Amino acid sequence: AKFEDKVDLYDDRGNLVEEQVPLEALSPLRNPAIKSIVQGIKRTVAVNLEGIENALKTAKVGGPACKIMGRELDLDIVGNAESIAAAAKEMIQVTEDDDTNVELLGGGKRALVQVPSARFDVAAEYSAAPLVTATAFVQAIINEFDVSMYDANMVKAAVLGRYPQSVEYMGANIATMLDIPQKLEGPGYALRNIMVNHVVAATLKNTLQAAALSTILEQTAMFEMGDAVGAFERMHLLGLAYQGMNADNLVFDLVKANGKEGTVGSVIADLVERALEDGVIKVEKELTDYKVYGTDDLAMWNAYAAAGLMAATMVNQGAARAAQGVSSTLLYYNDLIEFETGLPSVDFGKVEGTAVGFSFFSHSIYGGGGPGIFNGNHIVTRHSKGFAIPCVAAAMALDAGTQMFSPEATSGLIKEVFSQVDEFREPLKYVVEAAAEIKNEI
Amino acid sequence: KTAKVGGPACKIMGRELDLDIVGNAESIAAAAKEMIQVTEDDDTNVELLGGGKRALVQVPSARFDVAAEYSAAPLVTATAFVQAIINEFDVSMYDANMVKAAVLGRYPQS
Amino acid sequence: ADKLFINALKKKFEESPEEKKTTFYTLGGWKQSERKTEFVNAGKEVAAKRGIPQYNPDIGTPLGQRVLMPYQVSTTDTYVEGDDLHFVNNAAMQQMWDDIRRTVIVGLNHAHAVIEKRLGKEVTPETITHYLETVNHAMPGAAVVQEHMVETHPALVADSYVKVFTGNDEIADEIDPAFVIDINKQFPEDQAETLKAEVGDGIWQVVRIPTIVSRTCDGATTSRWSAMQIGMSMISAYKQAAGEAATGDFAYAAKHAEVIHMGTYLPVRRARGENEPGGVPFGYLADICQSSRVNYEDPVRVSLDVVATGAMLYDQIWLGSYMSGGVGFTQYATAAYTDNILDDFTYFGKEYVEDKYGLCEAPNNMDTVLDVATEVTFYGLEQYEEYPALLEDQFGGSQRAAVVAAAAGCSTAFATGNAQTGLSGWYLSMYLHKEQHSRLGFYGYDLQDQCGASNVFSIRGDEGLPLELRGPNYPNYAMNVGHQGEYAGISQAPHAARGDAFVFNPLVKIAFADDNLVFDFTNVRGEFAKGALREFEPAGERALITPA
Amino acid sequence: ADKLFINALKKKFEESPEEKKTTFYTLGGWKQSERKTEFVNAGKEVAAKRGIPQYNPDIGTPLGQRVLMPYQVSTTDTYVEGDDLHFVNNAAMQQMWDDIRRTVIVGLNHAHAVIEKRLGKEVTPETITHYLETVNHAMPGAAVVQEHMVETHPALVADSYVKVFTGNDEIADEIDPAFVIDINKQFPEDQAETLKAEVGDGIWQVVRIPTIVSRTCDGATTSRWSAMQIGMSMISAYKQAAGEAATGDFAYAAKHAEVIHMGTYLPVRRARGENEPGGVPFGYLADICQSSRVNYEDPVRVSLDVVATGAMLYDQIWLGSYMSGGVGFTQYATAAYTDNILDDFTYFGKEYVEDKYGLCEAPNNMDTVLDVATEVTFYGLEQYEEYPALLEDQFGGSQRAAVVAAAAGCSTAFATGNAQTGLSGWYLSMYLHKEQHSRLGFYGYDLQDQCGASNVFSIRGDEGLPLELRGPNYPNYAMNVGHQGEYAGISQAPHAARGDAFVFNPLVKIAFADDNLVFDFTNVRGEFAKGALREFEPAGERALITPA
Amino acid sequence: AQYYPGTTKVAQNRRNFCNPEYELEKLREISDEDVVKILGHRAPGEEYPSVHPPLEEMDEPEDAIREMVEPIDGAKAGDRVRYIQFTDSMYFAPAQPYVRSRAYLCRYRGADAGTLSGRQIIETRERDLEKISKELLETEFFDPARSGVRGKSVHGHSLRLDEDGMMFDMLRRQIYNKDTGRVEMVKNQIGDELDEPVDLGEPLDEETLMEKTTIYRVDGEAYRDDVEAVEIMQRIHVLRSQGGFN
C-alpha cells in the first residue's frame, strides 16, 4: 500500500458491510466496480424508438420546431421493435458472446443499448457508443421496411438530428449520460459533463446513491485530469471515501444526529467535535476566549469537513425538500467552519468559491438555472475538484417537486434506460463489495 | 532559465529560474515514474534519451481503462514532471508556477 | 421572345451578343471606369493623409485591358459596375447580415409556465402587453429596476425591439398591433393556415438587438443580450423579487430551452459562436428570405430570390471575408443574381417540367434526375456557346458551373417535389458540364462535387442529411464558393413548387415577416440594387456621437 | 495635498465630502439630467417614426431619486455623466476594441526562408520595401494579378495597412521608413535596447485589416484576411506563378506557423474564434496599452492606464455585451478609471512600499504579501468611511472591492517585483474587506476570490499559471466583473516598477507603438474622455456609400 | 460553538447573532397579518398556494436520509418557496449582509440564504418564511431607519442618510413620522401601497446603534484594531495558499 489508511464501509441503511478496508481499494485506479461503472457509462445509450417513429411520421427532424413538408414517412417501428433491435444488435456486437446488450423497454418504445466494451479498448474516446448505436438502428430500420435510397436520409435525420451541420446531435432521438468531446471545458473533463438531473434519475432519487454516483464520476475525472496524481492523491481518495462513500458512517451519523431539528450550524458543531474526538484536529493556540485549531493531516481534516458538508446539505435541503438552497449550504458551511476553527474549508476555499458563483447563477438573470442543470463541466461549477457537485446531486434527490427543470423534465429518457443498470442505480453497493473483495491485494 | 513560457515570443522578465534539469534527469525521471505508475512493475515506461535531454513516457494502460478518453497521458505526465522538478530542487511556492508554465504552456487560458 | 439576359448583354458591349470577335487594349485601362477613377483619386488622398502608400493602379497588373462591365441586378433595371456589389461598398448587403445576426427567436411558453407554477401568478393578454411595453424600453439598453443606471442613447439603438407571434388569433388580435407579427396580414390564406397550425397556441418573441452592438461584438452576443433584457422585463412586469431562485428558470429558458438561434456554433478550425453565417442551415436561409409570401404564384422567382440571399451572404461575406478576405468573391456570387442569366435557365427548366410532368408530379427517383438535370444542363451550356458575350460576361468556369447546376437542381426539385433528388441533379450537372467543356471551376471547386453523388443519399454519421438540414458546416461544403447559396435555392425550389409556407422552420419564416426590419427581406435583389446605388440607409452608424 | 478624489466629490455634490447627511427625492427624477432629458426626447422621436414604443422614463422605477452624478475621467479634467462612458455611446471605446480585433502580427522569417531556400530568390531591404508597397495596395482589398477584379473603396478602408519592425537597426533603416515601426523613435533608450535584443534579426509585420470589415465580421477574420493579401503580395512582388506548390508554404506560415493572434479561441459554452476579448491574456493587454513607453518615470500611472484599458474592454464590452448585454456594466468599470480614486489608493501604497522596502526590494514571500496588502486595504476602506460622499459615489460593493484590491495587489507587486505575490495580495484584500464591512460584492463576485488564495501558487493542470499568462478564460475568471482589467494592472505593476519594456510579449508591445492606429494607446483615459465628449472620430463608417 | 474571533463589541455581536442560544432582543410588536402584508406574497385570508402536493399524498420510495430528516411544516404542505430581503446601512445598522447569512444558517432550518453588498435574502417554504420573518422584523436584526425590507430597487446601503436619519429608498417604502418619532411601512417589500400602514416603532438612537452594530468602521470600532480577528483572517489566507500548492 502507498497509504496506511483504512476505512469502514456501510450500506445505504447505515449498516456495516466491511471493516478496515485499505483506502486504495476504493481508488478508481484499483476498484473493479468503479472500472465497470466508468466503462458502462462510456458504452450505454438510450434509443427512443417511439420518438424516431413520430419524428418520421411528422417529418419533424433537425431540432426544435423544424419540419420538412412533403418528407413524412409512416413506418411501424414500435410494432416491429423486436426485429429492428435484433438486427441492430447483430451490427453493434463484435462477436456473438461478448458483452453487447440490447433490451426493449416500454413495450418496444425504448431500447437499452450497451455497446461492447472491446470497441472502446481500440478507440481514443467514447463517441463510438452513440455513433455505432445510431448507424446500427438507422440501417436496421431501413432494412426492416425496405426504405428507399430517396427516403433513407430522413431516417438518419430522425435518429441523429442535424449532425454534422450542427456539432451536437441536434434533434437526435438517442441519448447518453456523456456529452460530445468538443464540449469539454478542458482535456480530461468528460466524466464531469454529466447533468446532475441524469445522476438523480439513474439512481431513482435515492439520496446516498445519487451522492455516491456523482462522487465516483467527479473523483474518477480528477484522476483523468491528473489532479489526483502525486501530492494530491490521498486528499482525493479520502474525499471519495468520506464524502461520497459514507466511510466510517460519518455522513450517515451526522444526518441522524441533526435530521429532526438541525441546521447547517448544528452539523458544523458536531463535525468539529468528531474531528477533535478522533485526533484529526487539536487546539494549537488560545486567543481571547477562542481556540485556534491546527491539524497535522490536512487531507484528513479536508475529508472530515467534506463529510460534514454532505451531511449539512442533506439536513438543510432535506428539511426544505427543496434543492435551491444547496448553493447557500455549499457557501456558508465553508465560510462558518473557517471562522469556527481557524482551519481552511473544504478544498481550501474552492467549494466556497464554486458556491458563490453557483448561488449567483441559480438566482439571477445572467445564466445557469436550477441545481439540476449543473454538472462538473459547467463553467459555474467546475472549480472545486469533486467536492461540490455530489452535494448538488443529494439536494436534487431530496427535492419534492419545486423545480421546473426537474429530472422528470430533463432526464426521462435517461431515467427509463439507465436506471435499469444495477451498477448505475446502486453504485454504493457494488463499489463497497468490490473494495472488500480486493482488500488483501492492496 | 530564460523565462520564455506561454507561447511564441512570450517572456516574463524577472521570473528566470536556473535549474540543472538535464544534469539531474535520472533522479527527476525516476520520481516522475513513481507518480505516473499505478503499481510497481506495471506497464509504465519512463526512458531517458539524448543523454537526459528527452524522455519517452508511456503512462500505464490501466489509467485509460478508467478514463473517458486519452488526455490523461499529457496531463498525468505533465504533473508528475512538474512535481518531480519542484521536489528535485526544492523550488519554492512562489516560483513553482513557472515550472508549470514551462511544462504545459498557457493552458488553461488557451 | 429574347432570352432574359439579352437586354443586359446589349448594355454591356457594343456588339450584338451573338458576335464572336471584339477589340481589346484600347480603353485606357482603369481610365474607362467611373468607379476605378474614383478609387485612384481616393487612394492618392488616403495615402497623403496617413503617410503610407495605399491604392495605386500601377502596382501589379493593369486592370481594364478588356471592357470592365456593368451588371444588371436581376429583376431590376439597375446597372452598376461590380465594385458596387462588393459587400464592403454596399450598405444593403452589410445590413442584410446584421438583421440576421442580431435576431433571435425566444419562446414565452416556459416562461409563462414558470409564472403560473413557481410564482403562482396569472398570465393574460393584458399582462403580455404590459411585459411587451417593458421589454421594448429595456431591450435597446435601458433600465427598469435599479437606481443610478446609465443607458444606451435611444437613437443609436432605434433598430432594436421585440415583437411576438402566435397561432392563436384571439391572443394575437388582442395585443397592441405595434408588438405583433400578424400572420393573417403577412401571409396569403393557405400559407397563414399552415403557419398558424405549426405554431398553435405557442407564443414566440422575435428579438432584434441593436445593429451598433452586433457590429461591435459578434453573433453569439445576440441570445445573451436578448435574455438579459427579457429577464429584467419579466422581473419588472410580473413583480418577482429582483433576483430569486425562479429568476434562473427565465434565464435558462431564454438562453437555452426555448431559444432558436439563426446559426449554431462551429468547430475549432473555423471557431465561431452562434449566429454566424456558417451555422445558418440552408433551410433557415430559404425561410429568412421572404419572397415565398409575396411571389408565391411564381416558384422560380421565390427560389432565385433565395439563391440571391445565400450567394451574397455565404460567398461574399462568409467565405469571402470571415473565411478568407481581401478583394474576395463578389463576382463568384453576382453570377447568381445578375443579368437575368440564372433566371433564363431556371424558367426554361420550370417550363420543361411543367409541360412534361406537371410540377411535383414526376416520380421521385433517379430517372427523373437523369432526365431533367441533363436537359437543363445542356440548355444552359448551349447559351454560353450561342452567345459569346454571355461567356465573356460569366468568364470564370466556377460561376457558370454554379448557375447551370442551380437551374438543373432547382428544376429537378420542381419536378419531384423533393430537395434530395434536386441535389442529385446539381451533382449530375457538374459531371456533364466537366465532360462537355473539359473544365468546370477553380482548382478546388468540385471537392464537394466529386464526393457529391455518393453523399446525396448516404445515411452515415457525417455524410447523411436531408439538404434542408445541411449548411456551410456540412463537411464537404465547408470551404468553397459557388455552392452554398445555390443549395439554399434548391432547398426552397420543391417547397415553392408545392406551395409550402416554409422549407424547414416555420418560426424562422414568420420571424422575418416584418417591415420594421431595416432590410426588406421580401425583395432581396431590389435591396442589393438600392445599396449599389448608395441609396440604402443602414442602422448602426456613429454620426450622432462624432463631430460634424 | 488633498486626496486625489476630493475635487471630483466637490463637483458631484453640494455637501462637503465628509458630510454624513443629505437630501433626496427633490431633483425631479430624470429631469435633473441633461443626458436623460436627451434620451426621453429621442425615445419619443424613435417610437413615433417606427411605430413601436421604445425608451420611456415611466416604465419600471424612476431614476434620479438621488443625484445622478458626473464622473471625472481620471488624469483628465473632463466631467461627464456615466452614460457618456457606456461603450455604445462612446466611439473611442468601440474603436479601441476594433483596433485590437483587426490587428495581427505576422512574421516574415519563415516566409523569407521559403523565398531563399525553395524559390531560390534573394531577400534584401529593397525586395522587402517592394513587397511592402505591394501589400499596402492589396491589404485594404485591391487587386494585383487578375483581370476584371472589383475592389473595396479605398476611402472606406483607409485605416487598413501593413508595417514592419526588426531589432537590427541597420536593416530597419534600409527599408522605406513609411512602413517601419521605429523602435528607437518610439521607446526610451533602455527599453528600446531590451526590445531590439528580444527581436534580434527577426522581421515581423503588423497587419491591420479595415474596421468596416472587422465590424461586419468577427475577430477570427483578421488573420485570414491578413494572410490572403500577404499571399497575393508575395506572388506579385517575388514573381511566383500565381498559384504553385510553394504558394501554400506562405499560407501556412502567415495563417499558423508565424502568426501571433491578439486572442486565442474559446471553449464551446462561450464559443468564439481568435481575436475576441476573452482570448486576450492579461500580459498582452498590458503590452497593448502604450503607457509603459511614455510614462515610465511613474509606475502607478503606467499600471492604472493598463487597468483602464482592461476594465473597459473586459467588463463593458466583453463581460457586459459579448457575455451578457443590455444596460450592461459601465460603472463596474468606471469605478477603476474615474474620480482619481484608484489613483489615490495606489499612490498611497506605492509611497508606503518606497518608505518601508524600496521598489522591488522586498522579499518575494508571504510576509510581504501580508504586510503590504493589509496596509493598503485598510487605507482604501478608511477612505470610504471618512468620506460619505466617496461611499455614495462608488455605491456598489463590487466596485469598491475591485478598486481597493487593485491598489493592494499593484502595491504588493511594486514591493516584490513579482506579479504572483501581487495576485495573492489581491485575494487577501478581498478577505479582509469582507470581514471589515460584512459585505464584499454582488451575489457572485467572490467565486474566484474564494478559490483565489489556493489557486495563486497551485501547479495543477487547470489551476497553475503565472498571472501574466492568465486571462478571461482562466477557469475561475471566466464569468465575473470587477477582476479582469484589475488583474491586467497587477500584471503590469511589477514590470513598471522594474522598468521592464514589456510584461509578456515584446512583439505585442512594439505592435501598438504606432501613431497610424485610430485610437491613441499611449493615452487610454484621455481617449475615453474624448469619446465621452463626442469628439472622437472612428473608422469604419458608411457615410460615403449612403444618402447624403 | 465559538462562531467568530475578536474582542470588540462588533465581534461579540456577530457571535450573538449566530448563536441560537442567544435571545435576540425584541424591539417592536408586529401582528401576523401585518408580516403577511409586508411580505406581499398572499392576501390576508388567502390559502397558501402550492407548488406540489402534500408529501403524505406522494408515497415515495424508501430513502434512509429522507426518513431521518424531518421536513419543515411548509415542505409537508407543499407550499411555494418565497423570500424576504433586507438592505442594511453601512451607517451602523445592527445586522449586515454576511452576519445575516451566517446567522440564518445557524438558527433556521431549510434555509437558502444569499449575501450581496446592497441586499441579503432568505428563501424558504411560505408558512415557515412567515414565522421567521416575524423574528427578523421584531428583533434587533432590524432597525426601521438603518435597515429596509426591499424585494427590488435596493440602492441605499452605501448612501448618506437623509435629515431624519433614514436610509435612502428609491421607492420610499418606510416613512419616518416626525409627529410620533416612529417609522411606518407604507408599501410592501416590492413597493405596492398597503391599504393601511404598519407601525415599525422608533429608530434606535446613536448610542444603542453603536452598542448593537456588527459593521467595523474608523468612527466606531475599526477592524484593524481587532487584532485577533485580523489574525484569524490572515491565518486562513496563508493556510489556503499553502494547501493549494502542496
Ligand code: F43
Ligand atoms: C435584478 C438584479 C439581479 C440580477 O441578476 N441583476 C440585477 C439587475 C441588473 C441590471 C439592472 C438594469 C435595470 O435596472 O433594468 C443590469 C444593468 C444588467 C442588465 N440587464 O443590463 C445590472 N444589474 Ni446589478 N448592477 C450593478 C450593481 C448592482 C448592486 C447594486 C447595489 C446598490 O446598492 O445599488 C447589486 C448587487 C449588490 O448588492 O452587490 C445589484 C443587484 C441586481 N442586479 C439585482 C437588482 C437589484 C435591485 O433590485 O435594485 N447590481 C452594482 O453594484 C454597481 C454596477 C451596477 C451595474 C450597472 C453598471 O455597471 O453601470 C448593474 C448591472
Ligand SMILES: C[C@@H](OP(=O)(O)O)[C@H](NC(=O)CCCCCCCCS)C(=O)O
Ligand atoms: C454561465 C454561462 O451561462 P449559461 O449557464 O447560460 O451557459 C455564461 N455566462 C456568463 O458567464 C455571464 C458572465 C457575465 C455576466 C454575469 C457575471 C457578472 C454579473 S455583474 C455563458 O453565457 O456562456
Ligand SMILES: O=S(=O)(O)CCS
Ligand atoms: O486559382 S485557384 O483555383 O487556386 C483560386 C481561384 S479564386
Ligand SMILES: O=S(=O)(O)CCS
Ligand atoms: O444581484 S446580483 O448579484 O445577482 C447581480 C449584480 S449586477
Ligand SMILES: [Mg+2]
Ligand atoms: Mg479557555
Ligand SMILES: [Mg+2]
Ligand atoms: Mg420597407
Ligand SMILES: [Mg+2]
Ligand atoms: Mg427600405
Ligand SMILES: [Mg+2]
Ligand atoms: Mg499604522
Ligand SMILES: [Mg+2]
Ligand atoms: Mg494620434
Ligand SMILES: [Mg+2]
Ligand atoms: Mg405578536
Ligand SMILES: [Zn+2]
Ligand atoms: Zn462584429
